[PDB]
Amino acid sequence: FTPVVLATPIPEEVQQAQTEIKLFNKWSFEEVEVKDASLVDYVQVRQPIFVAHTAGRYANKRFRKAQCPIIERLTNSLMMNGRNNGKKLKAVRIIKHTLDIINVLTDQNPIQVVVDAITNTGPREDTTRVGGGGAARRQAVDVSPLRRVNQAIALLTIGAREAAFRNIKTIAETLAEELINAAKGSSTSYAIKKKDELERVAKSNR
Amino acid sequence: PGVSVRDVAAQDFINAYASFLQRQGKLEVPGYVDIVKTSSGNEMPPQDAEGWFYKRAASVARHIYMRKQVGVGKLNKLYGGAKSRGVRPYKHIDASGSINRKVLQALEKIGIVEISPKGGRRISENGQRDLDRIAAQTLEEDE
Amino acid sequence: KKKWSKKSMKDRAQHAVILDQEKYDRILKEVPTYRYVSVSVLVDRLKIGGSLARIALRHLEKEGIIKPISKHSKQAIYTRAT
Amino acid sequence: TPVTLAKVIKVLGRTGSRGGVTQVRVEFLEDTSRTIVRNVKGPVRENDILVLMESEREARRLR
Amino acid sequence: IKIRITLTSTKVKQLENVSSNIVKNAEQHNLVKKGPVRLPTKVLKISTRKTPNGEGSKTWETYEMRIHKRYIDLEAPVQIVKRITQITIEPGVDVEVVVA
């Protein structure tokens, strides 16, 4: 290895971080592929990052939000519920803590678990307003791949946030349990159940 | 080498200097240690009970090392914080002046901080050497 | 007046506040089977109150089995060290 | 879940009473040369593979 | 003798040429000196309601005024405080001669 020690020494673990790209210091971005070809080119996993805290220029135009790391999007969507506005230093702390539980329990790469979960909880069909003129009326339409990822992330965040409301379990394990259960496609997930509701509603009003 | 108080993390150094202040309590112990609230903004006395005076002394001395001159009001402003004024919104409130005064005078008695020109206090010549010797210790404790 | 909201918690199953013996044998033989262990895990499955997991989580970390994968602010993540 | 992978080649325009849906001319990757028009709720520009749960329903302007 | 020429005004152009004339009189003869020091502008701001009465949508105002301050540092004996004291004063800007 490269044992270079400067005048100000750095721990060997940080020196190890220079071999591969950032890697969240413990978790491979590579060997992580989105199973669905529909969500390819919209779930950014190729570009690696040390941390999920960047001041990107993502909201100026339409589609630079697609060119954003998926892990960073999870931290942004975990920053909601009113009083928890800002405090991005916190948001990455649960993400780091939750991401660890995905490694201690269900021992695969947690980044892989994240990407397959969002591809398995993104609605494929949805209903829309068409009331036109006459009280109400629904009508089913399709969902774009970008909206599939956005809806998938939103459902996972709100489900763990609600399940952590007035409960001993912290948001770290609640996020971990929600993502793991959605990863394997189990019915106990709030996001999976919500996807069933939207798809069934669209199927009935087809 | 060339280690010093700036070559150390804050938490480890303050605890280490608190460790090398409790083992021999040479500095002082005020009579009202267990009844102060550290400020009019804080609602409860510190839960350290037995200590918390050499912990503040460790923090004050480390703060003195990186600076040149401070005052008791400066320590009050630094060690203060927001106060929950009931339904009214929070507001910055200075710390307890007597507590910082007793700490600052206590650091003078041992010989770690003394008065300086242009007003205020300053780290002592014996104070600088022992505080730097602390840094040479806390790094090698983990080594 | 009217509230349009519910007012009930559940049924507080208050449990151990001081560690006893009949569950001291329980903990030493039951947590070493936890692939993931933390403060909340034995609060739910082992049914332990507030100021006993933190001591118990400090218990085995200093003594034996479970190991500090990631112990940090408000989250002590430990595995089934074997 | 029998789905059909279909990639758009042309976007007609956003439709609906509130502009929440869009008409797109989309062709299927498998069994190509067959082209249909479908509705999209989210943002779509081109080369987007939408998961079509059912591939047999002609789309039209919605009120 | 540490003559310092302090100039304050609200018009930048009129204050600039006064400093230019003072500095041009300085660089003539010998008069080793320090050039114009550019102090930050003091921007007064009084915010007031446009409505004289209380009726009307809340529409506030801001009447601002900028003060430009520059001082000229001279260093020479009495043979120039017979010469510098000839004030090159334009309307607006003012001068305050301060020694030591």
Place this chain on the structure above:
Amino acid sequence: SLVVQEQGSFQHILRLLNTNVDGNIKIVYALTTIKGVGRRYSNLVCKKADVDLHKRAGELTQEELERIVQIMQNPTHYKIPAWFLNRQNDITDGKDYHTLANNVESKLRDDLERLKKIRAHRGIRHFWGLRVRGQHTKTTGRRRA
């Protein structure tokens, strides 16, 4: 490891100063149930009694509760600041007092009755049921009758 067992001395409930003191909680906060004792005063009483603050109310030896109890009924004798009492410079005598569970409520009625009998503004408004500290009542304090 700072783990200790229990033999049976734990009592799930206490009774100090003629009031219910529930156990299962830390001693510093289990004493807050007494009418007239708060978080700071209970912390002060426990600190001078040397009762090992990190101790549950049930897991307390009986020899320490009497020491706590005696401090409750006579704080000024045990080096307690004169400014750490609820009833300071009593209108009857002037000695610094400290009302207790039953004394806090009873003494409260006496001073209102003293205020009422003298026909002062605070006394009459207390009988009326309105505010006595000068708050506005036009839009506040409605659901009281």
Place this chain on the structure above:
Amino acid sequence: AVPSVQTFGKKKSATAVAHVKAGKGLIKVNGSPITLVEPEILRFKVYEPLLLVGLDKFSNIDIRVRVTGGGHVSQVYAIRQAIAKGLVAYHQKYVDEQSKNELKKAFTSYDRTLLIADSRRPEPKKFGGKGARSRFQKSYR
């Protein structure tokens, strides 16, 4: 006359100047080693310019950075930008382009913010609301 260069950097309102002279590999901020940040999470964010290309180019330089202004993350973003521009400046007064041009290409290939400062700045507050776009709550009846 010992070899040295200087740079600057801002995030929102902070400033960070790196006097990168010729040394034995000392990276210090406000007299403290680089390993003592403060967010303890963006420590790898300030570790960035150290690790994109390698530590071999950092073995003959000492970067001393003084920072003033902004929040804790703003200070961190000031430090990373200053040292990244400090590295290129040392390569922009002594060393060849191949050292510099692939240094200065790779830095922006990962993120443009390492050299290019964030152009966005706070907008002035307008009357009628707590912020610029935000307005007070209006009501009828």
Place this chain on the structure above:
RNA sequence: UUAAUUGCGAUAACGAACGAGACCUUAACCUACUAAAUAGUGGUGCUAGCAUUUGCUGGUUAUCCACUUCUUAGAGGGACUA
């Protein structure tokens, strides 16, 4: 077509005026100019602590020297969608 009767152009209309635009201020850029202990930076002396092996962290206006990258400005440049 444009944020805009803002333009292309059409045309019993031609030539115009006000508004808009243009303009002014502020926020961003300048390692290019003028500079500056009422803003700083580096260096030379005095002096302190750690290690002394080569250094690091500091304090110091009469210890002086040099500079304006950061700090402020004045005159200017840059942006026109190329």
Place this chain on the structure above:
RNA sequence: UGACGGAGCCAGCGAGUCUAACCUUGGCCGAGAGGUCUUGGUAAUCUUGUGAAACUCCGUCGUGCUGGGGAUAGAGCAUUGUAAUUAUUGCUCUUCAACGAGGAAUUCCUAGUAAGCGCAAGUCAUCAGCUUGCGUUGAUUACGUCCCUGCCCUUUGUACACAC
């Protein structure tokens, strides 16, 4: 994604006394409010690096109308003023009520913006939960429509002209 107790602990706008008594540094006394003897400043110079808060790291706690939350009151200690009583305000102890995410309906918002956070100034002898500005942390969601609420031009109809 909490409260509490320790530590780290970083900003910008702006104001400040002459024949007055302002901003107050520093030392001393007091748990605190505050008091006391002085110092610097007509101001990039002194207050002030406004060492602000939200923030982060160690611990206390535990899912508990509880260590959440501080209305309601009782007693005491000081400041401002000729005067404070229907407490100006500040500080200490104690009392610890509604409130467990809010129904018909409705407000604001497309980037450093929303939101969270504090600061300065205005009113001022004293009193911010207000307003005007400043900076700190900093999301999701559109790149479209006239469906609802309104606007501009043209065509068309009118028994309207104080004009649906």
